[PDB]
Amino acid sequence: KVQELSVYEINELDRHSPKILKNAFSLMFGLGDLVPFTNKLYTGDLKKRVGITAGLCVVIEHVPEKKGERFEATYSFYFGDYGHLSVQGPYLTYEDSFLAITGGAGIFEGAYGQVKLQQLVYPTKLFYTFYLKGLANDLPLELTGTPVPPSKDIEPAPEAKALEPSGVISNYTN
Amino acid sequence: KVQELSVYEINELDRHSPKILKNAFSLMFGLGDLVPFTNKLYTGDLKKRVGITAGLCVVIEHVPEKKGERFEATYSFYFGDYGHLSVQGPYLTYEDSFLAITGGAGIFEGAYGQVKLQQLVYPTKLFYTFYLKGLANDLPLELTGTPVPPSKDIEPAPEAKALEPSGVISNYTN
Amino acid sequence: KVQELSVYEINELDRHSPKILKNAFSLMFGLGDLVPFTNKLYTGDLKKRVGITAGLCVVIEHVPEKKGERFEATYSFYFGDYGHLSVQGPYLTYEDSFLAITGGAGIFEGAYGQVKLQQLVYPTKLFYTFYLKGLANDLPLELTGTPVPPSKDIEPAPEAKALEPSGVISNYTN
Numbered sequence: 334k335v336q337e338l339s340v341y342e343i344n345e346l347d348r349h350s351p352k353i354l355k356n357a358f359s360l361m362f363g364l365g366d367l368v369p370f371t372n373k374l375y376t377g378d379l380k381k382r383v384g385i386t387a388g389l390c391v392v393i394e395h396v397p398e399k400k401g402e403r404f405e406a407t408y409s410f411y412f413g414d415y416g417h418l419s420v421q422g423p424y425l426t427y428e429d430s431f432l433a434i435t436g437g438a439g440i441f442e443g444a445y446g447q448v449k450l451q452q453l454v455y456p457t458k459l460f461y462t463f464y465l466k467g468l469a470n471d472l473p474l475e476l477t478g479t480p481v482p483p484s485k486d487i488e489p490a491p492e493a494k495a496l497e498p499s500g501v502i503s504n505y506t507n
Numbered sequence: 508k509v510q511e512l513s514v515y516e517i518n519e520l521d522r523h524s525p526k527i528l529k530n531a532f533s534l535m536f537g538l539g540d541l542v543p544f545t546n547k548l549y550t551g552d553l554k555k556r557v558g559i560t561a562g563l564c565v566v567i568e569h570v571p572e573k574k575g576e577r578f579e580a581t582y583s584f585y586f587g588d589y590g591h592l593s594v595q596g597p598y599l600t601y602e603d604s605f606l607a608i609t610g611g612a613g614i615f616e617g618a619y620g621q622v623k624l625q626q627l628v629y630p631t632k633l634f635y636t637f638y639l640k641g642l643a644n645d646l647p648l649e650l651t652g653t654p655v656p657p658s659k660d661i662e663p664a665p666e667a668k669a670l671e672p673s674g675v676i677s678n679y680t681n
Numbered sequence: 682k683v684q685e686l687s688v689y690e691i692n693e694l695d696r697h698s699p700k701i702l703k704n705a706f707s708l709m710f711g712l713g714d715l716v717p718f719t720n721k722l723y724t725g726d727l728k729k730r731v732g733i734t735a736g737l738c739v740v741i742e743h744v745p746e747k748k749g750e751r752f753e754a755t756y757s758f759y760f761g762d763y764g765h766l767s768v769q770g771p772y773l774t775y776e777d778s779f780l781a782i783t784g785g786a787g788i789f790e791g792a793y794g795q796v797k798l799q800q801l802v803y804p805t806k807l808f809y810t811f812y813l814k815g816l817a818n819d820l821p822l823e824l825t826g827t828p829v830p831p832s833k834d835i836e837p838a839p840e841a842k843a844l845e846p847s848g849v850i851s852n853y854t855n
């Protein structure tokens with residue numbers, strides 16, 4: 334059985350991210366350029382802070398006909414005491430993509446499948462949908478609420494942004 | 508149930524690849540050196556362009572007794588609209604190796620197993636055989652034509668090098 | 682069926698490791714800093730040299746209230762002629778963590794699950810317990826001797842440090 338899990342990734346500009354390591358000779362992004370990053374992670378219903386994203390984007394090429402970039406990404410999604418999911422695959426600044434779920438830990442031990450990446454604001458807001466197989470149990474209800482409709486206007490609940498107990502999961506990752 | 512999938516990876520020198528980020532003190536390759544890369548990918552029977560490889564080789568050490576290098580590699584194999592496969596493991600410039608299949612997306616959702624890497628011409632021609640488990644369906648026939656036996660003299664079909672419709676899969680990755 | 686596999690990772694200061702690639706505008710580790718590394722790997726009972734670790738630590742943040750750093754790690758564990766295990770997930774210099782097992786090769790083909798990381802001496806001694814699922818066979822006896830309980834004072838057997846045949850596995854990775 335497949336369990337669907339959606340989350341919002343938001344860059345609130347307070348984690349030094351992204352860091353651009355410019356090694357390609359061009360003013361535009363190119364092969365050689367490396368981009369370590371870490372953003373905040375919220376539930377799909379935007380009610381609770383769950384953790385962070387964390388990893389590395391490797392520039393593969395500039396795509397002038399689409400006015401954007403192709404990256405190859407290696408990173409994880411942290412859900413506090415619930416554990417984490419790890420992924421590998423493409424991030425295209427100009428269109429949606431699917432990444433491979435490489436594994437997980439905690440409640441995500443044994444995870445496999447794929448995840449859809451949808452960019453809403455380049456690069457500060459993204460919406461993910463994980464198609465999770467291999468989990469030992471049903472996902473906890475506080476992670477499976479109906480998602481807010483994805484758009485460039487989405488915002489976390491005020492309590493979540495402010496890190497009030499009602500707006501965070503237990504030991505949310507920071 | 509294992510499904511064998513073979514592909515040829517070819518560096519045609521038109522993707523700015525490899526990019527060498529030389530940070531080690533050694534005059535030879537050494538720990539600290541990083542090599543982002545992206546090559547072209549063709550079917551095992553060399554009749555069609557399918558996509559690209561994309562990722563990062565991390566130098567681990569120079570191996571002077573073998574006149575070559577050990578890399579630790581993290582990268583993906585793209586097959587146009589069919590999806591992609593992701594891998595992790597050793598790339599040794601001086602001998603064949605096996606890498607882990609970390610997962611996949613599209614028709615490769617659920618992929619697991621190992622892949623054999625055989626270098627045919629250093630650094631421009633490599634042959635892979637994926638021993639794929641976990642897939643939902645039989646691989647499409649377009650991808651499973653009988654492979655050309657590997658040797659240093661192999662070449663992709665002229666029509667595939669020229670990107671003619673009969674020499675590419677639909678929406679091949681580039 | 683879970684098979685537990687424990688190993689010790691030791692930096693004996695003879696592999697040029699770790700290599701720090703400094704890009705954060707900070708005296709402390711920060712986002713932008715990259716750390717390619719490779720350490721020696723010994724069996725859990727400390728009787729035998731098996732191989733090496735090899736990969737990349739990506740700094741995510743300095744955590745001053747915990748007097749340590751958060752890294753995102755992508756790397757492999759090499760076991761000589763037996764094959765390798767690959768992983769993805771968090772390395773926290775200040776506490777234990779669990780990483781995803783992303784896959785394997787050789788006798789580790791098909792591996793999945795999670796692995797516990799325990800730091801013993803920062804940064805030179807670590808202990809791991811892999812909770813391995815998906816393997817084709819029982820692990821070989823020379824890898825599954827009763828582990829030495831982790832403590833800061835552990836040392837590999839003298840025969841293993843001296844690379845005598847009784848203290849190594851066949852074709853131990855180096």
Ligand SMILES: CCCCC[C@@H]1O[C@@H]1C/C=C\CCCCCCCC(=O)O
Nearest residue numbers: 350351352353368370390406424456459
């Ligand atoms: C793979 C998922 C990535 C999620 C977004 C995360 O931010 C990374 C994306 C990597 C590179 C995007 C590049 C955009 C450049 C603008 C940033 C401004 C700056 O701080 O210099």
Ligand SMILES: CCCCC[C@@H]1O[C@@H]1C/C=C\CCCCCCCC(=O)O
Nearest residue numbers: 698699701716718720738754772804807
């Ligand atoms: C993910 C497992 C880590 C294994 C330990 C291996 O050594 C790498 C860990 C990466 C970074 C540790 C930081 C070392 C700082 C040492 C300071 C001294 C120096 O500048 O050489």
